[PDB]
Amino acid sequence: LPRPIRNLEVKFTKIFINNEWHESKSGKKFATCNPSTREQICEVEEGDKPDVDKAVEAAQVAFQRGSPWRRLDALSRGRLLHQLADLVERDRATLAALETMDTGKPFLHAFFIDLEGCIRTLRYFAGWADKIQGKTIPTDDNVVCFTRHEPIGVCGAITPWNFPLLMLVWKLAPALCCGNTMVLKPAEQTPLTALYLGSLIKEAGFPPGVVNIVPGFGPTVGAAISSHPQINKIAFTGSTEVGKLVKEAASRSNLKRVTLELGGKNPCIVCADADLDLAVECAHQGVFFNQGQCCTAASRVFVEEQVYSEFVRRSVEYAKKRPVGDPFDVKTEQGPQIDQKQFDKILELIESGKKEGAKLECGGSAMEDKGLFIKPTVFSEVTDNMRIAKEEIFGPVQPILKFKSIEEVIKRANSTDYGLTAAVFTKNLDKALKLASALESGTVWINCYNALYAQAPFGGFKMSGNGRELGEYALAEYTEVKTVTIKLG
Amino acid sequence: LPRPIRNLEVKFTKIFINNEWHESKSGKKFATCNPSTREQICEVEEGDKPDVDKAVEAAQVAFQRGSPWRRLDALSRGRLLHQLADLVERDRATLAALETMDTGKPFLHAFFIDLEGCIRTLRYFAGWADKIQGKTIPTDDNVVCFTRHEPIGVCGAITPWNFPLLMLVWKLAPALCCGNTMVLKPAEQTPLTALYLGSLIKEAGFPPGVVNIVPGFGPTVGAAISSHPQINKIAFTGSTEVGKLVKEAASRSNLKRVTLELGGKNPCIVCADADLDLAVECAHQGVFFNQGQCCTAASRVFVEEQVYSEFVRRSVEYAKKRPVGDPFDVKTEQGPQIDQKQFDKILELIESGKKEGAKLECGGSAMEDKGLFIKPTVFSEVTDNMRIAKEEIFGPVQPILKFKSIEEVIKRANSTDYGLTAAVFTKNLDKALKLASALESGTVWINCYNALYAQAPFGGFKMSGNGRELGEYALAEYTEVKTVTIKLG
Amino acid sequence: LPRPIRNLEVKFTKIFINNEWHESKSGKKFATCNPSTREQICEVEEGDKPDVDKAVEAAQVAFQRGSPWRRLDALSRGRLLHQLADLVERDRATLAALETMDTGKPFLHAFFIDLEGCIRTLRYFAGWADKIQGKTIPTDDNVVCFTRHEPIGVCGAITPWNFPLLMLVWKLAPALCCGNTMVLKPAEQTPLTALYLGSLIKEAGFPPGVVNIVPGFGPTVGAAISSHPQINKIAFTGSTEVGKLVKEAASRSNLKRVTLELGGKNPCIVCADADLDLAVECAHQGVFFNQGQCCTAASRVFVEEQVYSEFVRRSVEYAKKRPVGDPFDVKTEQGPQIDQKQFDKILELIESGKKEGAKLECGGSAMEDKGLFIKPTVFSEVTDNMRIAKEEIFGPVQPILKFKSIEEVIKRANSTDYGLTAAVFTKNLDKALKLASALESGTVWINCYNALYAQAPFGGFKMSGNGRELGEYALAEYTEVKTVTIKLG
Amino acid sequence: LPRPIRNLEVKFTKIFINNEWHESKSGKKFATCNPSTREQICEVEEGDKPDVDKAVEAAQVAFQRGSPWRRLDALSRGRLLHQLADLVERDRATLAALETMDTGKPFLHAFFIDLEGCIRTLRYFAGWADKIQGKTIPTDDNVVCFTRHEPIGVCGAITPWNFPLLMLVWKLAPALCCGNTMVLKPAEQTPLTALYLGSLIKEAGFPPGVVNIVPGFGPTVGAAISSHPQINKIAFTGSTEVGKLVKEAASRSNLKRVTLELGGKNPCIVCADADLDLAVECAHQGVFFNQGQCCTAASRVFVEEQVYSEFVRRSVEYAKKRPVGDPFDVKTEQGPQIDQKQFDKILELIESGKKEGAKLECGGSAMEDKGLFIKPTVFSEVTDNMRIAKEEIFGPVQPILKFKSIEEVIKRANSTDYGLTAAVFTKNLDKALKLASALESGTVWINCYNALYAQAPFGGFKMSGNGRELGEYALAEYTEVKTVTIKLG
Ligand SMILES: Nc1ncnc2c1ncn2[C@@H]1O[C@H](COP(=O)(O)OP(=O)(O)OP(=O)(O)O)[C@@H](O)[C@H]1O
Ligand SMILES: Nc1ncnc2c1ncn2[C@@H]1O[C@H](COP(=O)(O)OP(=O)(O)OP(=O)(O)O)[C@@H](O)[C@H]1O
């Protein structure tokens, strides 16, 4: 196991433009606080519209025809991404420590999950660089028709506080592999790993202006990016409400392309013939992973009547044994919630459960009267009309609903405006495939949960998003199709 | 040559929902007028939000799991699209006549261009129905991962007045081949071919509710479609201003997927080494086709200084010899403009060209005093700052500009916020490919103009659009990607 | 049900070259006899090397640059195949009757299985004609690299007696859709449907020389095709021994490309958790379909010990009720075997079973002392070392073997030099996917048998063949890849 | 520039099986000689059929289900290929020196051409490992159909003496990225780089038996590989005569899949409108690269009559100035021929050119009386009937032929039984694309020569080969397609 870095000094705190560090144009700065201790970590330069303008102009110059970035052969863009992955691997412990300090997630989770995801995603897209292929299309005997899959141009990337570096890398890896330039805006709560990544981008050898990073607030920096007349594409991960604002501003300004990865009301369907211990363990990790602060979180655990009582019993047992505490301690599986507004929202939803008729099986309150920790909570006798079964909790709360038939559970699982993920637990071939086909979700897991691969696309149906991240499908978000039609005389 | 149907009676004027004809819920009707005779053709039912709600509910019921449309095998949807193409070919004369009546385009142009495009597009996408393939993705030894390219659901289609049936078919053909259901809104100026197509959809055997058609106005029917919470995707063709409103309405409502095909400020570049007579004939058809009312119309004809004078001279001969008159006459190459608003807009721009310093080479005024016909107009000595060079004329006006170097003409051609099409005329291999690569346009034609194929994608860069129509690329706009990841125990 | 044509006169009996009918160069003729009655049907022209030379020269002329076939646009080759499918549909009863007379298979099987397969295959490949796309490959900033998927040229097609027309159409549909020309050789036992198809090819409008048909014997016509210096590709379906000779002659002569579809020793694995009645019915159809004369025939039925005795009992019941008799009679499910050498081989293998220790559960002898009919036979207590479990019977004999574990049955099923098809019967998700992954077979059916689709590739692993027929994969057998690399100055 | 290793000691001379070094079962050894010094370099173990049987059994054990190689995830095979590329780059100087010692090619050519190709090919295919994707195919509402692109199994690789390491890497890179295991046979003249690569395969961490190397002769080791019943695929590069023997042996034995990369009679067409100096430099490197010992060598330089005399004149200057000598010297562009047999064959053809009427413009004899060096030779007035135009010289002889029209030169260029490469020099767009389409060659270069990319497929039409090497196309040669069709109950 890697040794934790409990007292790490943050070195990178400025705006990154043209491979140089800059103070904000206004001189303003903002603080980032450690959610575990509640103390201030450091001050970071606070960007605004003039800093975004400078970042966009640097990205435009780096993207113009004839530039060192545009002239690189396809395989050299791949080599640059591999070198970046090598540096992320070399500085893996430092990056994980910065993520633990900023988010409160356990150091070993940031090391083995977030950083592993970053490295695998960078290596995967490094391999696509010389494999982005268009088509030659048969038309007429005297015509030569083909398509080019060109880079779009300047890509904005706006990311959230729950998986800061990973959500950034999910955008940067396909964007750079396709030949685009970028302006990145990490969440104001979590700017540290993004700024450290900027130092690795320069050391890896990327030409200046290819990647630019402007820390700051959503309505200031984020809105300057979404409305920018010279940004050609935006990729956003965060709340559905902010995703709607970003896409509206993009449409109002220059019709820039927009990919959105938003929330979900994700179901977890446990059939009577499931491997019950596997279903209990996966639905537990599904609800409680990252303190329940994950877009993939299970928010509705539907269990067939035949195994309902036993499933609740084993779930209550798992929830009570989960070690909650200091993220740097090796034993910890659950750190604190990110902030007060998030924490208070969870407790208000927990209170709503008892009042509406759900049976509080365990937890249901804070761990201590000072910290941001909530005790792993489980509710049984949950019905569809309840608040704990309709609203995204984003916390450690497991609502367990009962069902009788497959046709019934398909209708109930799909009765939401969302569709990010779904999970099915059954040993039966036909039920597994029938449910995988019928569930309106971007990812359907069978007999597993949170099984992500850099080669498998991820994204939402309905209000859970537009477009896909990961896999070959990610390339379509970062390229523009040009048809060239030549008529021979 | 097919005989012109100069006195065709209109049979279909109602709202089409569940394969039945309905009056508008309000009882209101609007008139459609013939731009050649300036007389009313008929009254069509005027839809509003209640009619759109009824059409959407029919489309949702036809898309629900277990419906006859959803249970058809892949090859059977192809058979349906092929039968629809056979009916369009059988009724080709009636449809071309209805299109000439509504738009003023020559009958032979509607017959051999619009209708040929319709038939070819339907047959091409009929062939894709059993060829929409997802992927099997290698992950780990104990994992089976694959993608399904599922239909999106209810698709809205909002089309313009210049190529009414063709723009509708460009959306209907891939939508139905992918298994979606639809709500169509033809332009208020041109509803007749859309309603006749509804009668053919029923005759072809499409289950009720698979295609629904609601004639009416933009802020009423169109806005109800763009904002509907049960429409999952919208495809729009029309102006950049309205495309922005449609996309903002989509974002604000349910984040429905949006394809936009908008205007352009399309360059036509003629090099000194070009086959001059070929370039003259192509740039002439490129400006004057469909009375200049084309999204692909060349808005700036850039001609190299060495051949400028001769290009201008031959272009004037073509414009002066272009036959303008009754669209039902075999000799007619240019009919009237769509309406008085369009006609006055074109004359205002012609007047503006004279006032800003361009040399009026021919035309420059209306053909008569009581019609909507405009004399084919050519302007030389045009500069980039002029209104006739900066604005989309959407009329029979050819602005001819002069250039000296390739690098200069690339900068000038790309200086726009648009990027729909571009055309290049040169005999030099390196020059043709360098321009094909450097021009920021969705389609680049070389030694041809308006060369479209059902198998070649079409769409814009920048503010000319989002997404593609035609080719294999159209399928991505009408399907939603689902990852299924199975962990073997 | 279609009315049978018991006394149909065969109209087409000559060599088909350049859309004209010719007598053989030698004047020689051969007879085709009805295997049901044992009487002569008619005489057919007997081709040899000079008739193959004339057919190849006609195919070469039809393939040369500038020819009417080479100049057709991609979509028109698709239209021609659709018209051919329409004619095959129009003359479906006549074609099925010719196939029943030649092969002895029931009229309703030829009508609803063989002819349905022909029509679906022609329609499917008609849709690929304008969708055969190469690639544009990113290399260097100053390079334009792309691939063309060109037709190969003259394609020979050699087919067997068990599914005469279907095996021919599996080759002709992708060959013509890709733009190739052809020389067809049907089996000497079954030339009638191929010659009738020649009349439909001319009526459909294919240019002369695009398809040429030379009936005759294997060592004469077949060997002239396989060794021909001007045939560029051969596709063969038949025995492994003859497939080896064809590929050797192809390599010795001009290295012409060769696709082979050969025999198999196909296993059918029934797990204890299977739907037993479904497994019994599918393994019954799997063994006894087309009188056991099918490359897909189940030759080893492995049944798990827990359900072994019950599976044997229900199988014996199904075998005893199968109606054997006149192919034109509506009730008949099993006609006669094709010929004496085939029939005697079956009886010799049946005799070997009793002698080696297998338990003859039912049948085991001829139906009558005059005809070519064999009684549906089932053997239990079959072991791997036995002749009935190692050699391809090509008859109505069901060897039932017992197994205890999945790992054991994988090893035993894969212990053959063949690998055409496999079938698995289980309700368990994990076993179904583990077996589908581990079985070395070109097609793995789960809970079904003989489930073929024009869109799903079919072909063998190991000595069961080289290449694939059907699906998008079929196009790779009928195209040659050309890389065009252009360096810009 | 890298320092030449003029006295490198050979470390690896043994048979490589299961990551260990073995003596030949017979104890026999054969000598490898340096063509520059004409002295023995060392003795290498001489394999035979027993060594091939041992290597095949090791490869089969390493490919068996559950082996460490088979259980590695897709991305881990990519990591292994990348590590192998890093070791080849680290030992680049040693490998280039070993290649110069065995072949006589200049050290800098081996370093910047052969070794660069090796590294680029390994890195390209390392990127394909987790991107080999099958398809999900739409069939019926109750069917789940998909394809898997499985590894074929044990792959044999038989390579020639002209580009020893590069031809081996062209097979190894896609074979291993697809998950296959291998048995390699380098040419008897050039075994040293293959055995050094074996030491790097072990160092990189490939499990034992994944790559096995057996040096030896063709009719002994090569024939044992081509006829082996447990080798599932063979890839061969070399002469057309031997490729035929290999393919016939494959057919006769177990129908193992065969890729062939054979000789060519490659045309180089220079039009009157070409950049003459570019065409002279390209056709010179195209004939003289690697002492003329290239499968891509231009065998007929067709020059348009209008520029014929000037082309001949400038070509002679290039040939007379080409530095011939010690390959370890920085200035050397042409080393010795491979052996006495090759050297005498070239001189016999040079003598034949003089006797048949060609004008000897320069060279025409050996450089000295004791070496294997030949003076760069140019012949003008060459006609199609001559031996120097009809036969593959495989030496430094440039035959320059004259042509008048495009149609004439297309007929003459395609009159061969071969079709590996073609090159065209013209500034005209239509001429370049018409020739690219009409020339029957696997690769058509336009305004360049020998422009190869790891991402661009390479192979022949007609008797120049079967299948492709490089690009995505190479994956199809190293995978076997499996259709899995699941019927839901
Ligand atoms: N108006 C905006 N325009 C653009 N970006 C914004 C805007 N508002 C927020 N963002 C940015 O979007 C990203 C995601 O923020 P997010 O939607 O998750 O808000 P949140 O505070 O985390 O959620 P919540 O308010 O539901 O608790 C961050 O980088 C944030 O700064
Ligand atoms: N030597 C040959 N060369 C080429 N084609 C041949 C040759 N021998 C047979 N054929 C042809 O190949 C096709 C398939 O014949 P096939 O291999 O099935 O022989 P068969 O008589 O049916 O089998 P079996 O001898 O095992 O009972 C037929 O069209 C046949 O005429």
> Rounded CA gap, D144 and D412, in Å?
52
> Rounded CA gap, B121 and B98, in Å?
19
Atom of ligand 2 at shortest range from CA of C239:
17
* E-state strands within D186-230: 211-213
> Rounded CA gap, A114 and A125, in Å?
17
The answer to whether the Cβ–Cβ distance between D255 and C255 falls below 8 Å is no
HSE-CB for D290 with a 13 A CA cutoff: 24
Classify D297 as helix, strand or coil. coil
> Rounded CA gap, B446 and A109, in Å?
55
> Rounded CA gap, A67 and A145, in Å?
28
Q: If 0-12 CB within 10 Å is exposed, 13-18 middle and 19+ buried, where does residue D66 land?
A: exposed
* E-state strands within D187-245: 211-213, 233-237
Amino acid at C225: I
* E-state strands within B250-335: 257-261, 266-270, 298-304
B362 catalytically annotated: no
- Alpha carbon distances (Å) from D55 to B472, D151, D155, D184, D199: 46, 19, 11, 9, 16
Nearest residue of A to residue C141, measured between CA atoms: A71
D378, β-bridge pairs: D362, D398
The answer to whether the Cβ–Cβ distance between B123 and C433 falls below 8 Å is no
Which residue reads 């509003």 in tokens? B48
Closest residue by Cα to atom 6, ligand 1, is A218
The answer to whether the Cβ–Cβ distance between B456 and A244 falls below 8 Å is no
Q: Which of D295, D304, D333, D477 is catalytic?
A: D295
The answer to whether the Cβ–Cβ distance between C429 and B130 falls below 8 Å is no
Amino acid at C328: F
Which residue reads 């209000």 in tokens? A463
Per DSSP bridges, beta strands C40-45 and C29-33 are antiparallel
DSSP letter for each residue of C289-301:
GGGG-STT-EEEE
HSE-CB for D472 with a 13 A CA cutoff: 21
Amino acid at D179: G
Pocket test for ligand 2, best of C239, C242, C338 (most atoms within 8 A of CB): C242
Token pair of B238 as six digits: 């029309």
The answer to whether the Cβ–Cβ distance between A472 and D131 falls below 8 Å is yes
> Rounded CA gap, A170 and A121, in Å?
7
> Rounded CA gap, B332 and B325, in Å?
6
Classify B152 as helix, strand or coil. coil
SS (H, E, C) chain A: CCCCCCCCCCCCCCEEECCEEECCCCCCEEEEECCCCCCEEEEEECCCHHHHHHHHHHHHHHHCCCCHHHHCCHHHHHHHHHHHHHHHHHCHHHHHHHHHHHHCCCHHHHHHHHHHHHHHHHHHHHCCCCCCCEEEECCCCCEEEEEEEEECCEEEEECCCCCHHHHHHHHHHHHHHCCCEEEEECCCCCCHHHHHHHHHHHHHCCCCCCEEECCCCHHHHHHHHHHCCCCCEEEEECCHHHHHHHHHHHHHHCCCEEEEECCCCEEEEECCCCCHHHHHHHHHHHHHHHHHCCCCCEEEEEEECCCHHHHHHHHHHHHHHCCECCCCCCCCCECCCCCHHHHHHHHHHHHHHHHHCCEEEECCCECCCCCCCECCEEEEEECCCCHHHCCCCCCCEEEEEEECCHHHHHHHHCCCCCCCEEEEECCEHHHHHHHHHHCCCCEEEECCCCCCCCCCCECCCHHHEECCECCCCHHHHCEEEEEEEEECC
> Rounded CA gap, C161 and C338, in Å?
8
> Rounded CA gap, D207 and D201, in Å?
9
Per-residue DSSP letter, D222: I
Contact B288, B298 (CB under 8 A): no
Report how far ligand 1's centroid is from the alpha carbon of A159 (Å): 8
Question: Of B352, B335, B238, whose CA–CA distance to B292 is shortest?
Answer: B335
Token pair of D60 as six digits: 């089969």
Which residue stretches of B91-234 are H helix? 92-103, 107-109, 115-128, 164-177, 192-204, 223-226
> Rounded CA gap, C285 and C398, in Å?
11
**With contacts defined as CB-CB under 8 Å, which chain D residues touch A130?**
124, 127, 454-455
Distance between D246 CA and the closest CA of chain C, angstroms: 9
Report how far ligand 2's centroid is from the alpha carbon of C45 (Å): 18
Q: Identify which ligand lies nearest to the alpha carbon of C214.
A: 2
D477 is in an annotated binding site: no
Contact A245, A226 (CB under 8 A): yes
Which domains does chain D show, CATH number per domain?
Answer: 15-263+464-485 (3.40.605.10), 268-446 (3.40.309.10)
**With contacts defined as CB-CB under 8 Å, which chain B residues touch C75?**
120, 123-124, 454-455
Per DSSP bridges, beta strands C359-362 and C377-382 are antiparallel
SS (H, E, C) C149-161: EEECCEEEEECCC
> Rounded CA gap, B268 and B301, in Å?
5
Residues of A with CB under 8 A from a CB of C: 70-74, 130, 132-141, 146-149, 426-430, 432, 446-447
C256, β-bridge pairs: none
Would you mind telling me the total number of residues written for chain C in this entry? 489
A177 catalytically annotated: no
- Alpha carbon distances (Å) from D273 to A242, B199, B375, D428, D430: 60, 58, 43, 7, 12
Pocket test for ligand 1, best of A44, A46, A52, A158 (most atoms within 8 A of CB): A158
- Alpha carbon distances (Å) from B300 to B349, B459, C30: 14, 19, 72
Q: What share of chain B is helix, strand, coil (3-state, %, to 5)?
A: 40, 20, 35
- Alpha carbon distances (Å) from A230 to A45, A177, A181, B411: 23, 21, 12, 16
The answer to whether the Cβ–Cβ distance between B254 and A417 falls below 8 Å is yes
> Rounded CA gap, D163 and B11, in Å?
75
Which residue reads 């089309």 in tokens? B159
> Rounded CA gap, D34 and A187, in Å?
65
Contacting subunits of B (3+ beta carbon pairs below 8 A):
A, C, D
Contact A188, A223 (CB under 8 A): no
> Rounded CA gap, C102 and C189, in Å?
7
Contact C389, C379 (CB under 8 A): no
Could you count the other beta carbons within 10 Å of the beta carbon of residue C61? 15
Question: Of A24, A54, A85, whose CA–CA distance to A208 is shortest?
Answer: A54
* Of residues C132, C148, C432, nearest to A429 (C-beta): C432
| Method for this entry | X-ray
* Of residues A260, A482, A488, nearest to B255 (C-beta): A260
> Rounded CA gap, B383 and B397, in Å?
15
Closest residue by Cα to atom 19, ligand 1, is A239
**Packing angle, helices A240-253 and B240-253, rounded to 10:** 180
Phi, psi of D176 (to 5 degrees): -75, -35
**Packing angle, helices D429-438 and B429-438, rounded to 10:** 90
